[PDB]
Design a protein around this ligand. Structure first.
Ligand SMILES: *C/C=C/c1ccc(Cl)cc1
Length: 242
């Protein structure tokens, strides 16, 4: 549990005014190590970057969100937001997939939206995570389909949830998404991010165990696995004696 907690902490995209962003940056530099990233809205990226540099943790990544949390199907808007995130200085952009469009039978727009965002990101050496909103898709077949489309369009990560709807990650939706990664043969190039549904250290251990069982215990490094959830960092630190 201590070993799993330390591992999970170093895979966290930590999310919470400039004062609150600065405090977030401070909290990411924990007594047992740095989180993988902090996650902020685009406008907060410059002050976050300044703070991370000033505290001597320039390798903590800055992730942000676009097309968020709605997952609308206007590609030009999602692309504009993604380009702005890049311009602000993001290391990673988590875009919301147009899941409502998929539920209405339109697979193509999801492909096109992800691909457009990925092209912009790749040009700037920025990682793209795609949020498929498993809690709105609900159905296993639709979760697989959104995952497949996202990967085909060049997602660097597939992410469960925005954290802004009633139902976020579950172990089953995590398993389904990681099975897609495995089944498609893309475990080298595509990571998985769990958002929500991971309150405690014990929860984090269970989610890591799924990855370990599917891929082997070395797979879930920071390029391949991330966590974000309210309260999780505090629970991990408690498990570790802080
Ligand atoms: C998946 C990322 C969610 C999120 C929400 C809110 C902020 Cl500020 C950043 C990231």
């Amino acid at each position: 549990l201590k070993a799993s907690s330390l591992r999970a902490l170093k895979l966290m995209d930590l999310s919470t005014t400039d004062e609150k962003v600065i405090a977030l940056c401070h909290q990411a530099k924990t007594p047992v190590g740095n989180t993988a990233a902090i996650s902020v809205y685009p406008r907060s990226i410059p002050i976050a970057r300044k703070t991370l540099k000033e505290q001597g943790t320039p390798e903590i990544r800055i992730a942000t969100v676009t097309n968020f949390p709605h997952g609308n199907d206007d590609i030009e808007i999602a692309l504009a937001e993604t380009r702005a995130a890049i311009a602000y200085g993001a290391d990673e952009v988590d875009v919301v997939f147009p899941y409502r469009a998929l539920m209405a039978g339109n697979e193509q727009v999801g492909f096109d939206l992800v691909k457009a965002c990925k092209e912009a990101c790749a040009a700037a050496n920025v990682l793209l995570k795609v949020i498929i909103e498993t809690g709105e898709l609900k159905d296993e077949a639709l979760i697989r389909k959104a995952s497949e489309i996202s990967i085909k369009a060049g997602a660097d990560f597939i992410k469960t949830s925005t954290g802004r709807v009633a139902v976020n990650a579950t172990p089953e939706s995590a398993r389904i998404m990681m099975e897609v990664i495995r089944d498609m043969g893309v475990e080298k190039s595509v990571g998985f991010k769990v958002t929500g549904g991971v309150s405690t250290a014990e929860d984090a251990q269970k989610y890591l165990a799924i990855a370990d069982e599917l891929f082997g215990a070395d797979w879930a490094d920071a390029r391949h696995y991330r966590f974000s959830a309210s309260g999780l960092l505090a629970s991990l630190l408690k498990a570790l004696g802080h």
